[PDB]
Amino acid sequence: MIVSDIEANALLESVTKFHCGVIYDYSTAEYVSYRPSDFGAYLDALEAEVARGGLIVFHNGHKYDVPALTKLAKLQLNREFHLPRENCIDTLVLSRLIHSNLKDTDMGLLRSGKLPGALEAWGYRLGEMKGEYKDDFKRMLEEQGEEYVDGMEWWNFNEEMMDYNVQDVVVTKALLEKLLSDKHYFPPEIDFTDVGYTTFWSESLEAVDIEHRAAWLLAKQERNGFPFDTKAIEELYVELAARRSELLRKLTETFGSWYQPKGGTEMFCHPRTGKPLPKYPRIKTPKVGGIFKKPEPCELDTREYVAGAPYTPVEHVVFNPSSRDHIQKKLQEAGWVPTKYTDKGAPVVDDEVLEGVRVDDPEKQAAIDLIKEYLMIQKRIGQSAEGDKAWLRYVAEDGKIHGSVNPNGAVTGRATHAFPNLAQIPGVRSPYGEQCRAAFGAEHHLDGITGKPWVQAGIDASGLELRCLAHFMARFDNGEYAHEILNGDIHTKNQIAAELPTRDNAKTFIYGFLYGAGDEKIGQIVGAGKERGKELKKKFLENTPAIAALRESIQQTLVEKWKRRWIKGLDGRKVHVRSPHAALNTLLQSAGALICKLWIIKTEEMLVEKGLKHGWDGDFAYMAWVHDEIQVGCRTEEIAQVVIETAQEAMRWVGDHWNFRCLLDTEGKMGPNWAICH
Amino acid sequence: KIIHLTDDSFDTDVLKADGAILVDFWAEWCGPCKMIAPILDEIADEYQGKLTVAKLNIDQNPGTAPKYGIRGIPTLLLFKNGEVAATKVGALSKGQLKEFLDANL
DNA sequence: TAGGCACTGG
DNA sequence: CAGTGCCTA
Ligand SMILES: [Mg+2]
């Protein structure tokens, strides 16, 4: 087993030069540095570990080091280099599994300061290295009277860089051994720093293998990217901006500008007593100025001020439809009586309240809808074009958006998305959603050989969360709930229980039940907010004893205040639980997350087994995985049909693999883009 | 006997009135404005026949002040034949104002 | 819409 | 950094 790390001249996307690398070999207990002219030897060493059926450990190697080495070997040495997935270990991936209850800077992309809770020490250091190196470079130059350029520290190899490289491997080795010291995931009787790859995966907790496979596949998904219709979004941008201006023109006419205090630097005090008046806006008292400037009658002073005469400095302000403060100011002045305020003390003005607001003036009453529309349009513009993370700012040269994915960003095993967040694109049911979704599609990628548009296969797991509930209930109801889902009407069944009016309300109720929603959210489904919210849940459980039995066995496992602060996930991993009340929900959500994770992994492995190649230079390409659905780009319709049926096969395999008490299914849809494939 | 203007009446009451007119741009929430207010009441009485004192609350009539800039309040503008002849900003004393007026009148 | 990401205002 | 919206049931 070897631990390694490399330093190169840029992020994966534009890297062109290997600066150096370091290898620590457990078999020799020695660190070896490789400088620029040793690139070839570095590669030879990695492949030799592979020849021995060994393991290579990197920190974030799955997303950077491994693919960057393949890219660099080809560019600099005209060599084909492809480390197999089976021989690689990623301490970042392992940390996210073992310390899933903690957040991380995602390798320095996020400001540690904004993250909640504590951060794992070794991991924190690794993620801050680049910024740290940049600060040492910046200094050495600033000390030699030499100018600094934004990112020149990464242009050429140097000994300071080499030192950081070596430090990286020492810290990664420390992290690794710390992770491996966790007996829950690695049996104590085995020295995992002294075994072959097959033994490492087979003898460690199943979750270890699943997380590495998920990370490898998702790294490939990121590199694939999601084909994006830049031109269409630009046209959408023009349309949105025009409607924004017009809405602004109207609203600014309806609500005119006004003045507000600004720049005051002196407390206003009652001239009579001298009593400070902190409530009154700040004033300014001119030190110079007079009626007739300093000297037969003198000359009049053309200045606007007069020494000692105070005034309140003010600035002109124009109505801003995006300012909740301005909206609140203008509406109360119309006869609106704020019913709900915030904790920081302030009128609550979300879209909900704006809908209930009523004012006498008919024009101001109608303007509220214009304000609502302005806020929504502002939302669409920020997301697609003007925000810092706008889609138009992320489209790469290959005409695709390569959004990032943290495979295990949630403690339940659920993944998170960012840069940009491709799991928050407006749905087809939302205003402008159809245009937004149609812009992300396999059709926007023209085959490298034939120029023909690719086709899209959208696959979703069917009612996964409910089926997971059925599965866990089987120990108590012997599969009754699961049978009703597959061959009956679970919703009307849930309606009769908890006694509800519409069967659609049953659905609303259950889907909210699975995602531990407060009693309040339950009430709003009937129209008794937070009131019947306690009654409903209770009546449901009463008529569905298997669920109450489950909740009870779940809490007995945790509460003795705690005998254990986690539940065992489907692959054996610990899943932190915040409160006993959340136990069940955590259980269900984790089951769904892990089933979908293993599912997408098996789906891709089966496709490859069938002879299909993963990549734009191949037959299919994973473009997006959003909770329970995956969107896959396919070179031909025939392939898309194969992907759809293969995904169903993979899901059944997963249900059988984990002895699931409820049958699992998927539903697939073929089409040119995400608007049609959802 | 002070003239309480509105945006709609400003043009006629000020820019077309005969003689000098002292306009006071103020706000209810301004300490300095509340200070000079009673002073304005007195000047209006003592200069009756020689000067016309007018007031414009900028919150009730937001369309006029912008036309003259106004960076602070109270802003006292002396008009003559529909044009600004003199301007002072701040809560002047009855004396400084009396001096400002006599000097400009 | 519970959890995350991200935006605009001040 | 506060107040919100957008996704996912
Ligand atoms: Mg590195």
Side-chain angles (χ1 to χ4, degrees), chain A residues 1-12 14-113 115-141 143-146 148-159 161-182 184-230 232-261 263-278 280-283 285-286 288-290 293 295 297-298 301-302 304-336 338-342 344-371 373-479 481-506 508-514 516-518 523 527-529 533 536-537 540-541 543-555 557-560 562-563 565-577 579-678, chain B residues 2-17 19-33 35-70 72-79 81-97 100-105:
Chain A
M1 171 182 273
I2 65 177
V3 183
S4 199
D5 179 56
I6 77 180
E7 304 304 325
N9 75 335
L11 298 179
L12 182 59
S14 55
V15 70
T16 58
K17 195 175 305 180
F18 170 91
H19 287 316
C20 57
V22 173
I23 295 177
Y24 170 80
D25 199 324
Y26 271 101
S27 71
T28 65
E30 300 196 59
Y31 291 80
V32 176
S33 294
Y34 299 73
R35 293 176 174 67
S37 51
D38 300 301
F39 185 27
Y42 176 70
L43 296 176
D44 288 345
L46 296 194
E47 291 187 312
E49 179 60 29
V50 174
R52 288 185 290 274
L55 292 156
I56 310 176
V57 180
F58 288 106
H59 183 70
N60 191 53
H62 275 37
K63 285 177 68 169
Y64 186 69
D65 309 66
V66 171
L69 283 175
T70 294
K71 184 173 176 183
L72 295 173
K74 172 51 61 177
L75 284 181
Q76 300 187 67
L77 302 174
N78 192 29
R79 185 206 296 211
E80 292 299 316
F81 180 85
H82 309 274
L83 295 173
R85 186 231 87 211
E86 319 82 270
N87 305 95
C88 304
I89 289 170
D90 190 319
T91 51
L92 175 61
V93 176
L94 260 189
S95 293
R96 283 171 169 177
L97 168 60
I98 297 182
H99 299 286
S100 57
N101 57 309
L102 307 182
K103 294 300 174 67
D104 60 52
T105 60
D106 183 27
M107 287 303 280
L109 296 177
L110 306 167
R111 294 181 303 303
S112 48
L115 306 171
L119 301 179
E120 193 284 313
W122 300 126
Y124 171 83
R125 302 225 90 294
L126 296 168
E128 299 306 321
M129 225 58 101
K130 293 183 67 176
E132 184 173 304
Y133 166 64
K134 175 190 179 183
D135 286 353
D136 289 28
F137 199 78
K138 250 177 175 295
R139 175 173 62 276
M140 293 212 107
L141 291 178
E143 302 187 310
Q144 299 304 298
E146 204 175 312
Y148 173 79
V149 182
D150 191 57
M152 68 186 281
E153 68 273 32
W154 296 112
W155 300 347
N156 298 291
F157 166 76
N158 65 248
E159 290 311 304
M161 184 187 285
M162 183 81 257
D163 292 328
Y164 266 104
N165 195 180
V166 171
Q167 183 190 68
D168 272 348
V169 177
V170 304
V171 177
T172 298
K173 179 187 177 298
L175 210 199
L176 174 73
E177 295 176 339
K178 177 177 178 174
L179 291 171
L180 296 177
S181 76
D182 190 310
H184 181 88
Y185 301 81
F186 298 103
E189 53 272 42
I190 305 172
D191 180 348
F192 285 83
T193 65
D194 187 39
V195 302
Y197 81 80
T198 180
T199 293
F200 181 99
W201 304 123
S202 68
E203 305 284 296
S204 59
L205 196 67
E206 168 174 33
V208 175
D209 184 39
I210 288 178
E211 284 303 307
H212 277 86
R213 287 151 75 199
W216 188 272
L217 172 61
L218 291 163
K220 174 56 178 268
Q221 176 172 281
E222 283 188 25
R223 269 171 256 133
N224 285 342
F226 209 139
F228 183 75
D229 193 342
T230 302
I233 292 304
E234 297 184 316
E235 300 175 338
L236 175 65
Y237 179 34
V238 171
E239 167 181 347
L240 295 174
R243 181 57 175 173
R244 170 169 62 186
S245 294
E246 183 54 30
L247 288 175
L248 184 58
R249 190 186 66 68
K250 286 185 170 300
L251 291 175
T252 50
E253 215 295 295
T254 298
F255 305 116
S257 62
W258 65 90
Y259 284 89
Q260 288 183 175
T265 60
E266 310 180 14
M267 179 73 88
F268 182 65
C269 304
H270 189 164
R272 187 189 304 150
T273 55
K275 179 182 175 183
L277 300 181
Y280 268 92
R282 264 51 184 173
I283 61 177
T285 61
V288 305
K293 57 180 177 181
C298 307
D301 184 356
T302 178
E304 280 177 343
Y305 304 119
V306 51
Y311 66 104
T312 304
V314 301
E315 69 175 306
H316 199 202
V317 49
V318 180
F319 179 72
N320 187 344
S322 290
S323 170
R324 309 280 176 173
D325 182 55
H326 289 195
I327 302 166
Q328 165 282 296
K329 185 177 184 57
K330 289 294 184 174
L331 297 193
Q332 279 190 289
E333 300 178 359
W336 168 51
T339 292
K340 52 195 297 179
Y341 294 65
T342 60
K344 192 189 186 65
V348 181
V349 296
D350 51 34
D351 192 68
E352 296 190 7
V353 301
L354 295 179
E355 176 46 56
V357 173
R358 299 290 184 293
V359 296
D360 300 321
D361 180 315
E363 171 171 32
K364 294 178 178 308
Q365 180 65 54
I368 296 181
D369 289 325
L370 301 186
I371 291 164
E373 170 177 43
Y374 185 99
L375 293 168
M376 175 277 286
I377 283 177
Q378 193 73 299
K379 203 72 189 307
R380 296 288 181 286
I381 291 180
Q383 171 159 45
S384 71
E386 306 188 329
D388 281 0
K389 312 282 181 58
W391 304 327
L392 288 173
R393 290 182 196 290
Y394 271 112
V395 211
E397 216 183 10
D398 53 15
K400 301 153 176 57
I401 288 173
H402 303 262
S404 176
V405 169
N406 175 331
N408 208 63
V411 70
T412 49
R414 225 88 219 192
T416 53
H417 304 63
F419 314 126
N421 182 344
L422 304 179
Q424 65 182 178
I425 296 177
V428 297
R429 279 299 220 296
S430 296
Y432 300 102
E434 196 186 10
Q435 281 168 281
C436 288
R437 303 298 274 237
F440 290 83
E443 76 175 314
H444 307 303
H445 169 79
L446 307 181
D447 188 78
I449 290 175
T450 69
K452 302 274 65 186
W454 273 37
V455 174
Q456 197 166 320
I459 303 83
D460 213 299
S462 311
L464 191 49
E465 291 59 51
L466 243 171
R467 301 198 184 197
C468 289
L469 170 61
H471 167 73
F472 291 113
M473 287 172 68
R475 172 212 263 57
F476 309 102
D477 73 351
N478 305 107
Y481 209 77
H483 182 72
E484 180 71 18
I485 296 185
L486 282 46
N487 298 292
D489 190 311
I490 196 68
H491 298 302
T492 62
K493 180 181 183 296
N494 287 327
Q495 181 179 184
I496 291 182
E499 291 302 324
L500 292 181
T502 62
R503 63 112 54 181
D504 286 8
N505 265 50
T508 308
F509 169 71
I510 197 63
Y511 289 123
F513 190 77
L514 302 179
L536 295 179
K537 294 179 186 176
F540 176 65
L541 283 50
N543 290 301
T544 312
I547 299 189
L550 174 56
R551 288 193 165 198
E552 291 179 57
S553 58
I554 280 180
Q555 282 199 50
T557 292
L558 308 171
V559 184
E560 209 300 62
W562 298 88
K563 60 186 298 184
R565 291 195 175 70
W566 46 270
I567 174 51
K568 200 173 78 66
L570 292 175
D571 58 15
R573 65 222 267 161
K574 303 180 183 180
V575 183
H576 183 67
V577 176
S579 69
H581 173 55
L584 177 57
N585 163 262
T586 299
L587 177 72
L588 304 188
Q589 174 186 167
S590 183
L594 301 189
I595 275 168
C596 282
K597 182 164 288 181
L598 185 52
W599 167 55
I600 61 168
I601 289 168
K602 184 63 182 180
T603 291
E604 198 244 7
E605 183 170 66
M606 287 177 74
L607 291 179
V608 169
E609 282 179 358
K610 284 176 157 63
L612 285 46
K613 181 185 188 312
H614 195 171
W616 299 116
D617 62 333
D619 309 301
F620 70 95
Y622 271 44
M623 299 174 151
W625 168 40
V626 171
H627 256 228
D628 296 0
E629 74 178 297
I630 52 170
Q631 295 302 321
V632 183
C634 312
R635 189 166 52 71
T636 77
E637 241 178 52
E638 188 185 309
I639 287 171
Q641 293 174 317
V642 174
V643 163
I644 285 178
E645 18 185 280
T646 299
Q648 171 64 17
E649 285 168 37
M651 182 57 79
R652 288 303 181 81
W653 186 91
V654 166
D656 172 79
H657 174 75
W658 277 327
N659 310 302
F660 234 52
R661 310 289 253 93
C662 188
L663 195 59
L664 301 179
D665 295 297
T666 64
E667 169 194 57
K669 219 299 184 178
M670 185 178 304
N673 58 53
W674 212 348
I676 297 173
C677 295
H678 191 68
Chain B
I2 294 178
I3 296 182
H4 303 289
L5 309 168
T6 62
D7 279 331
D8 276 53
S9 77
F10 191 92
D11 192 310
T12 192
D13 287 339
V14 186
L15 308 180
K16 291 181 185 176
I21 314 170
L22 178 70
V23 179
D24 167 37
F25 295 84
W26 65 292
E28 177 71 53
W29 40 262
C30 173
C33 282
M35 278 172 68
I36 196 170
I39 296 301
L40 280 169
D41 295 320
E42 303 177 302
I43 274 57
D45 272 349
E46 314 186 317
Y47 288 65
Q48 60 183 62
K50 307 191 291 70
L51 176 66
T52 295
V53 184
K55 293 172 69 175
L56 179 78
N57 172 295
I58 63 182
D59 290 331
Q60 310 178 312
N61 307 281
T64 305
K67 297 187 178 181
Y68 301 105
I70 292 187
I73 55 174
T75 291
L76 313 173
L77 259 44
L78 183 46
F79 290 85
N81 282 310
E83 59 190 2
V84 177
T87 148
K88 251 54 174 59
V89 185
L92 286 52
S93 68
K94 184 168 175 56
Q96 314 173 68
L97 234 185
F100 174 60
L101 301 179
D102 297 321
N104 290 287
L105 276 41

